[PDB]
Structure 1
Amino acid sequence: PPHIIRLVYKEVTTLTADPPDGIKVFPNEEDLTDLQVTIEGPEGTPYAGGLFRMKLLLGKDFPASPPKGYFLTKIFHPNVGANGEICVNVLKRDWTAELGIRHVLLTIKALLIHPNPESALNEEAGRLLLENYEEYAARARLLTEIHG
């Protein structure tokens, strides 16, 4: 689909021109709907110092609906499930089709800073976060040192 080609152009060029801090995007030359992404773990969080790889699958309907996202880097996070699937409450609730990849990635980076344990795919991470933050952070830091 041509809109995908133009759309990836529009999305990737701007992302690389005024890059958000710690974010980089690698279009798969074989399949432009598969967008690979690295996000540096924000300072002052358990993910600090890590490089987190993820992919964004842009459906044919993008941007009518947001992409599906996966952390390829193993991570201990309330809103990241066993297969690496991401659940972002602002994406599934306040999405409009004027938004694009920049918004998606800033929302995911911001979720690393302030996870949402209510909508937790990883229920252990979510309970620790609310009830025993130090134990959540210790487990999030160790996976960061191994996998980031």
Structure 2
Amino acid sequence: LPPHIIRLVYKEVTTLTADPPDGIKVFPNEEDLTDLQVTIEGPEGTPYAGGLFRMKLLLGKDFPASPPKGYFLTKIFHPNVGANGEICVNVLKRDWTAELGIRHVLETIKCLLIHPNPESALNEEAGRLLLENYEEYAARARLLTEIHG
């Protein structure tokens, strides 16, 4: 990364590692800071309860101009998580500016486990069930959590 971007990423990761959001543990990668790994506890009162969900934030590309690219490394049944694990946070792409930190990105992803957005879903099956047959969506999400979480 360019030196001036490295400085900002190092500040962002330090403050985030020192004070991580509730239920999130951050594991910075000394050799490569374009690659921030995170684990998110599946919130209680959701089908993901009890599971640990590994995820990765890619701080390369155009960050801070553009939001970082997020991937779940833990398999998950979620309307906003695609087949490659890619996370599409519609709120974040609309709301983003270069002043928003990584704390808000991670907080926004964790909160999306509680309030998934079925509209314009990446996993259409999960989105279709969430709206039309919530208990079926919960069952599948929970079974995937028991295997992968």
**For the superposition of Structure 1 and Structure 2, which TM-score range results when normalised by the shorter chain?**
over 0.9
Match runs of 1:22-33 below 5 Å: 22-33=23-34
Match runs of 1:69-80 below 5 Å: 69-80=70-81
Q: CA RMSD in A?
A: 1.1
Structure 1 runs (4+) deviating above 6 angstroms are none
Structure 1 CA distance for aligned equivalents of residues 121 and 4 of structure 2: 34
By how many angstroms is 1:4 displaced?
3.1
User: For each residue in 1:61-117, what CA deviation from the matched residue of structure 2 results, as whole angstroms up to 9, or x when unmatched?
Assistant: 211110111100000000001111111011111101100110110010011000000
Counterpart contact for 2:17–2:27, Cα < 8 Å: no
Q: How many residues align?
A: 148
By how many angstroms is 1:60 displaced?
4.4
| SS of the residue 2:110 aligns to | helix
Bigger shift: residues 5-14 or 112-121: 5-14
Counterpart contact for 2:10–2:33, Cα < 8 Å: no
By how many angstroms is 1:119 displaced?
1.9
Q: For structure 1, list consecutive stretches of 5 or more residues without a partner in the other structure.
A: none
By how many angstroms is 1:59 displaced?
2.2
Structure 2 CA distance for aligned equivalents of residues 59 and 18 of structure 1: 23
State the percentage of identical aligned residues.
Answer: 99
User: For each residue in 1:117-138, what CA deviation from the matched residue of structure 2 results, as whole angstroms up to 9, or x when unmatched?
Assistant: 0020100000100011000000
Structure 1 CA distance for aligned equivalents of residues 77 and 68 of structure 2: 22
Q: For structure 2, list consecutive stretches of 5 or more residues without a partner in the other structure.
A: none
